[PDB]
Design a protein around this ligand. Structure first.
Ligand code: MG
Ligand code: ZN
Lengths: 174, 104, 49, 49, 58, 49, 73, 98, 82, 228, 225
RNA sequence: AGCGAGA
């Protein structure tokens, strides 16, 4: 950020820029957003029981003092949110940045190196939500009924969009 | 010969350190590897990879032959007449309390 | 951590810093509070009547 | 991942000559130099000697 | 969608489709899962914990 | 059993309405969407720290 | 496993492993020379591991544009 | 000079100047020992650790505006929302009873 | 389908692996290219030197390694393995 | 006075599909305005759709119409997703008819004045073996989605069977917000709407109408004390 | 077809609480409209609160005034429950002098022209024979919640003690709907919006301000036309 | 060097 804000002429020279940053002058936040972009970072959680204990993410700024982790990688770290402390490392060299961006990227490591079962799989909350969504409850509202002689089946719908629009009304249960 | 990389989902590369991956994969289920004398837990794993003679060393068949188990408390004697061969071997001190592993 | 009256009596005058209580026999006693004293672990040791 | 490991253990941690060099490269925008020998290996050498 | 079936789906998806698609699908799945778990109406209360009526006889 | 019995008699807050049923769960409105949640939700007072 | 590890041809790794005094004494008496071929050793002395991106086929790849790219210039 | 260590800030509650010049019982060698008391009023935010009395601990994922909070039929917004999935398998339904 | 990636995941890696033999090869390939272009930018002030690039119209504020990756995606580079 | 001016841009994906993007908004107004726009786009824009229909030779049996391949249900479905615009409030009637084998399409139906069909080249039904089909549509205009109204009269129209009515033009609106400029702007929110609508009206004009109706709707609240 | 827009009829229950019936509304719309209003009333209602005070014999908020029974921190907490309404954007100052025994309540403040205190009986502090509490407060217009500015933010010197401020009078907003949902589909929604404010402004004014705020953004949406 | 504590 010093380099960028000297390049941007927000500070005359390096030491003036260092003073600029040490007091967190207001102008040094926008440049910060500029620099952090497209710079991978490794997140370790001790102990690193296995290879997936350290993964590279693309960092993003957040307000307050807390590394906002992605839930789906929680299992990979075995890191559960009640006071775990996750260390952050910053690759520098071009080789290191390539390595972090390519080999270590969290989205590039889904399957376990041990048994290959997916490790970014939904679990706990997400799995319950999906189980509730995709399960079938006979006798629910808006069910299908093939009765004839008085009216049509009244269970079919033209398109899924129609189905959602009906569910918005208190007619069709999901 | 190694086979497919389990993580990448395709064949292995020509620089992968499969040794470290192997070892870490063996060790990772530690702790969650619980137990319920011959060991059967993490100590048992350690023994297997340590080549340590197990506590409950059950005798094993050596040469095909009719068996002439004799009755010795903590010291079962076990004779086996070799089908072709030399001389039947008796095992002076074998534990009686064990239970003979089933055969054909 | 809590101030307890040693002997009975009627509160003569109480302020944020101290409590002076008149005992049943002539004598009066003043408990001085401890205001915003630092505790051993950096917490506050405030007392208020 | 080998280069990042070498980077970590050499110029992020120990190498007393590379360290100022990587700082200079970052400040001025040049390519990160080649890592040297970590300064702990030499203390080991001297102690074994 | 038992967790088992989800695992099978993701395994097949990763085997067939390129990894990036797997990441995008997994992320969409997480989003939908959280939303519908919120709507799922799973809460714990003493009344929801039903003791078995035959306990004393056993 | 005493908890159930007490939870049954939970005299109304300000007007005539008992926000929590016998089970101990109430109907909660979603702040974001606005629609009420489809099922009642356990609600109460917890002492946390 | 322990014996197999301690029977390697690299005293700097065996010493890093366990029972330092004995292994160094033995290697010293034998005038043993470590060729620095494993991974622990390359870590210790801080040069590039011979694995993954460090082996001698990837470590020294030659990269250049194409003659068509030079023509684009 | 004594400077505020990195990551600290607040009000200067008290300063004590125990000096050899004032004939204070300073340890041999120091001529003037000064202690400055800095106090800060810490408010709740993401990362802080809360917990009830039944082992139901947790850090604060988020602090929503009061408007987008589940609010009862009477319009009283809830203050906290714990996760159901933690109750059964942690086997501490005392909280629920509480 | 892979609706367009947004950040560090652009271009998709699985597409890139077609251009090379192994992931490690891609890592080294991109890293050396990025080093080359970074030096090109550094030495642009002084007289022109052997280093060249970029071959793709860079983003205004875009790091050398992502430029290199964008080059790699379009088969604008060649390499020889040791 | 607001320190930041919201700006509404739009990315166009297909002929009728688009990503509307309004940034920045006082925190948190993304939801405040987004849930409203979604619901209004879905359930405020007037339109017309087939309300009931009858088929000659179809009196009590609703399984299969004779002389056609597609059974009753399928033709019900295809009529249901028949985009039409109307001007007269009262329920007009339309007559489709085709004799002989072939492929009956929407473009074959003859509409009276005041009602138009926006997809003549849509496949409706199939005829074979010199078969003949006649269909009468009772169609009016309305808003939202009205489920199949059970006929109040018992014997007044035995042939006229009710069908669910998709009056609204906008098909699917889905919204999400993001959290731009956490630091410089103190985390202002931006709304991304995704709008999918039939070819009856373009997504942009549909939003213009939605915004207009919301204006007029909250004009009720503003009317009380305008000088607020 | 509805062909009938809604209307908003008010009824008043008490001085600071009221209800508003909006009818007729399109089916399944009242919840959205009520939630929108509620969220407006809960976020963006321009208010006014004490933004910084100053006691004569105090330098910071972590001390005690002699004679006063409450710490300065307890006094700031008591003031923070104050409700006031101002008429000018510029910061205004209002004084509070009390001496001798007695209860210092909100009725003892001398508000200058425009600004007023609506809850005179609020207990600020209590005194004794030796206590002398003189405090000048600063009231400023704004919206929402803002953390206390710092002493280094402005030129105020030492004596200034910034305080957190809550610029909003809306105490409680809820809504309920009773949709007809008849089998003949002549449906409509009646929305009952109950609004309670802290006596600073009648609910009528709060609802009007919310309507103004909303129609601004939706008029932007219309201006897309 | 010694204490206590979090995961
Ligand atoms: Mg934990
Ligand atoms: Zn082989």
């Amino acid at each position: 950020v010093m380099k960028r804000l000297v390049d941007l002429n927000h500070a005359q020279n390096i030491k003036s820029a260092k003073r600029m940053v040490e007091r967190q002058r207001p102008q040094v936040w926008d440049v910060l957003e500029e620099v952090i972009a497209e710079h991978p970072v490794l997140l370790n959680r001790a102990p690193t029981l296995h290879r997936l204990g350290i993964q590279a993410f693309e960092p993003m700024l957040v307000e307050g003092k807390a590394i906002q982790l992605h839930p789906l990688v929680c299992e990979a770290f075995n890191a559960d949110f009640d006071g775990d402390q996750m260390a952050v490392h910053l690759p520098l060299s071009a080789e290191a940045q390539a390595e972090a961006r390519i080999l270590m990227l969290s989205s590039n490591n889904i399957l376990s190196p041990a048994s290959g079962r997916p490790l970014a799989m939904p679990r706990l909350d997400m799995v319950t939500g999906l189980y509730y969504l995709t399960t079938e409850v006979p006798g629910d509202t808006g069910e299908y009924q093939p009765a004839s002689g008085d009216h049509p089946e009244t269970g079919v719908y033209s398109s899924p969009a129609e189905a959602i629009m009906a569910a918005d009304r208190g007619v069709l249960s999901v | 010969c190694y086979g497919r990389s389990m993580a990448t989902g395709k064949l292995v590369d020509i620089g992968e350190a499969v040794g470290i991956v192997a070892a870490q994969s063996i060790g990772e289920p530690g702790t969650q590897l619980t137990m319920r004398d011959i060991t059967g837990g993490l100590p048992r794993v350690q023994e297997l990879f340590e080549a340590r003679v197990p506590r409950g060393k059950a005798p094993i068949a050596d040469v095909t032959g009719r068996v002439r188990l004799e009755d010795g408390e903590r010291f079962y004697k076990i004779t086996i007449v070799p089908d072709d061969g030399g001389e039947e071997v008796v095992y002076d001190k074998i534990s009686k309390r064990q239970r003979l592993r089933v055969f054909k | 951590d809590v101030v307890v009256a040693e002997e009975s009596g009627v509160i003569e005058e109480v302020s944020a810093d101290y409590i002076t209580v008149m005992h049943d026999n002539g004598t009066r006693r003043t408990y001085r509070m401890r205001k915003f004293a630092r505790s051993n672990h950096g917490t506050c040791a405030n007392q208020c009547p | 991942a080998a280069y990042t490991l070498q980077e970590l253990l050499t110029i992020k941690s120990d190498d007393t000559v590379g360290r100022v060099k990587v700082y200079e490269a970052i400040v001025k925008g040049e390519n990160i130099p080649e890592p040297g020998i970590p300064e702990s290996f030499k203390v080991l050498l001297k102690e074994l000697q | 969608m038992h967790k088992k079936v989800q695992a099978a789906i993701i395994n097949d998806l990763a085997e067939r489709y390129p990894m990036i698609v797997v990441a995008q699908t997994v992320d969409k799945l997480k989003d939908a899962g959280f939303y519908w778990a919120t709507r799922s109406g799973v809460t714990v209360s003493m009344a929801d914990v039903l003791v078995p009526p035959r306990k004393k006889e056993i | 059993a005493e908890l159930q019995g007490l939870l049954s008699c939970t005299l109304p807050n300000r007007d005539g309405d008992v926000l929590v049923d016998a089970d101990g769960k109430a109907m909660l409105f979603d702040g974001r969407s606005g629609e009420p949640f489809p099922y009642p939700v356990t609600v109460g007072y917890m002492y946390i720290m | 496993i322990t014996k197999a590890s301690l029977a390697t041809d690299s005293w700097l790794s065996a010493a890093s492993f366990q029972e330092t005094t004995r292994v160094l004494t033995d290697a010293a008496i034998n005038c043993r020379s470590d060729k620095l071929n494993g991974l622990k050793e390359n870590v210790i002395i801080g040069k590039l591991i011979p694995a993954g991106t460090g082996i001698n086929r990837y470590r020294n790849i030659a990269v250049q544009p194409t003659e068509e790219a030079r023509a684009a210039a | 000079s004594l400077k505020v260590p990195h990551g600290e800030s607040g009000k200067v509650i008290g300063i004590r100047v125990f000096s050899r010049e004032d004939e204070d019982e300073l340890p041999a060698g120091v001529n003037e020992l000064v202690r400055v008391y800095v106090a800060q009023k810490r408010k709740i935010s993401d990362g802080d650790k809360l917990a009830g009395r039944h082992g139901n601990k947790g850090v604060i994922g988020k602090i929503l505006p009061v408007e987008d909070m589940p609010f009862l039929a009477d319009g009283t917004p809830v203050d906290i929302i714990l996760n159901t999935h933690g109750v059964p398998r942690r086997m501490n339904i005392g909280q629920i009873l509480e | 389908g892979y609706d367009t990636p947004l950040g560090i995941t652009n271009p998709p890696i699985d597409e890139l692996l077609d251009r090379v033999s192994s992931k490690y090869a891609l890592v080294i390939y991109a890293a050396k290219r990025a080093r080359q272009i970074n030096d090109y930018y550094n030495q642009l002030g002084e007289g022109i030197l052997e280093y060249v690039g970029p071959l793709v119209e860079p983003g205004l504020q875009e790091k050398p390694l992502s430029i290199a990756l964008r080059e790699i995606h379009a088969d604008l580079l060649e390499h020889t393995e040791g | 006075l607001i320190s930041q001016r919201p700006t509404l841009s739009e990315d166009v994906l297909t002929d009728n599909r688009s990503q509307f993007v309004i940034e920045p908004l006082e925190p948190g107004f993304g939801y405040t305005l987004g849930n409203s726009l979604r619901r209004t786009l879905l359930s405020s824009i007037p339109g017309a759709a087939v309300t009931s229909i009858r088929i000659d030779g179809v009196l009590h049996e609703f399984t299969t119409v004779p002389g056609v391949k597609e059974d009753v249900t399928e033709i019900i479905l295809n009529l249901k997703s028949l985009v039409v615009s109307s001007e007269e409030d009262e329920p007009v009637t339309m007559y489709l008819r085709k004799q002989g084998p072939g492929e009956v399409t929407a473009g074959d139906i003859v509409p009276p004045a005041g009602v138009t069909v926006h997809n003549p080249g849509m496949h409706i039904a199939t005829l074979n073996d010199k078969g003949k089909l006649e269909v009468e549509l009772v169609v009016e205009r309305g808003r939202g989605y009205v489920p199949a109204v059970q006929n109040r009269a018992s014997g007044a129209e035995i042939g006229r069977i009710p069908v669910d009515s998709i009056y609204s033009p906008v098909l699917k609106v889905t919204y999400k917000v993001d959290a731009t400029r956490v630091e410089q702007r103190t985390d202002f929110d931006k709304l991304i709407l995704d709008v999918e609508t039939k070819n009856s009206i373009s997504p942009r004009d549909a939003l213009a109408s939605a915004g207009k109706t919301l204006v007029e709707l909250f004009g009720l609240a503003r009317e009380l004390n305008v000088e607020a």
